[PDB]
Design a protein around this ligand. Sequence first.
Ligand SMILES: *CC(=O)NCC1CCN(S(=O)(=O)c2ccc(I)cc2)CC1
Ligand SMILES: [Ca+2]
Ligand SMILES: [Ca+2]
Ligand SMILES: [Ca+2]
Ligand SMILES: [Mg+2]
Lengths: 11, 11, 233, 227
Amino acid sequence: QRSTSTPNVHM
Amino acid sequence: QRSTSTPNVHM
Amino acid sequence: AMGSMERASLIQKAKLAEQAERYEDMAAFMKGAVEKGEELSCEERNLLSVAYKNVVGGQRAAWRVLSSIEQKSNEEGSEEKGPEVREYREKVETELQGVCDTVLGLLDSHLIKEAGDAESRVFYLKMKGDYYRYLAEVATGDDKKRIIDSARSAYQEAMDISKKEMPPTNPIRLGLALNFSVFHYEIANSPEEAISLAKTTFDEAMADLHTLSSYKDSTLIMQLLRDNLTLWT
Amino acid sequence: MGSMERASLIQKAKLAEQAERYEDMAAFMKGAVEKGEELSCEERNLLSVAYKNVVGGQRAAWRVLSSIEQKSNGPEVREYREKVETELQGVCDTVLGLLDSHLIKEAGDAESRVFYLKMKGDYYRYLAEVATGDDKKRIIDSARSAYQEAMDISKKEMPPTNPIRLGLALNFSVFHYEIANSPEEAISLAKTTFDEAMADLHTLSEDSYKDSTLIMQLLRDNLTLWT
Ligand SMILES: *CC(=O)NCC1CCN(S(=O)(=O)c2ccc(I)cc2)CC1
Ligand SMILES: [Ca+2]
Ligand SMILES: [Ca+2]
Ligand SMILES: [Ca+2]
Ligand SMILES: [Mg+2]
């Protein structure tokens, strides 16, 4: 239901 | 593998 | 007293804290490293971001649980319950706000001005937009309006630079656009702009995929744009 | 905490639990204990769950750091392991302080006395995991003494399949195996506990069946691991 933002992972 | 103790759940 | 600590020791301790899942400590170590006044590397930006996002992410999840309990209690409208959940929601909210203020302080005092390349400047401006967005989620009234404008201004400056300076598949550019689209939909009540931005971002990225090494990271963010588009359809 | 009413502290602990804010939960329950009334079974659950989440996180972190330190064998990993260790010891001392100043009494039902003595054994055992030298010996003796008193009460006053008695025996068997270098006693205690519990399981209340069968499965799994 909430939009997804950028994940908290190492890029 | 360490021994398992009583779990942290509501009894 | 981190002022007198070796920068390299602070970075090593941040990595130790990360392995131990001690994210508050990790963030404090990275704050100390930032305060040394040197630019950050790519790995250091990852450490800073991961540490503070774990701390604020936990607070946001807690605040959401408590806000829902509060609202449910108030709606039932019983003569006798509600004061405790309101007070404890306020406590969590105050702690959240404090962490966001710390991050915004670091960005303003050390990181944004001192960045020496477009990629890192865009990263830091995105981060500024994100932490104002997290403040906006818990803000009310006139404060809310000012905070929303601050987030918008940071994201727009980041977007302006990224379009001029970076490829459409760059993961910093992609993550910025993703987050700004979420701002539009969830915060600014602008679904049209959210959808428009997400679609443009996705399409422009897809056109250049054939050039990438990088592919894993780019395609992951692109999938999230697509998931949001499906949700908003 | 002292300015809040007892009922408000209990309510806030339940809210903190729902929000997965276990440090806050523990502080609320410490405040509730300090009001000087006994805890109900539900409130003992809140107390136990809160402090075990906090110390559990600390123990996991200390183990990661200690592994890195040993593999390495500059100063940073030792310094940071010491910092986490000192925080762990602080939490264990807070719990042990509460048990001694407020919770453990000669009065009260068997369930409550055994629960609190088991808790004392557990928190001394967590201190023993990080201790060295002469301090370690004293700490191990304190754990053993608390567990043994609890065992003596439980054998006199509780049925063999009671889940508090079972959890105590399970933890004491872990103490023997992992702390006291006593594998024979660990295995003997776990097997005797398992058998005597199964012999009386037909008498156990339905309200306790899921809990007691969970603990008996853990005794079985440890027995498989140790043999
Ligand atoms: C009735 C009462 O005192 N209830 C509180 C619980 C008693 C048992 N403890 S415990 O840590 O010994 C435990 C046993 C079994 C299981 I399943 C979980 C925990 C918890 C508080
Ligand atoms: Ca507020
Ligand atoms: Ca460029
Ligand atoms: Ca075996
Ligand atoms: Mg020490």
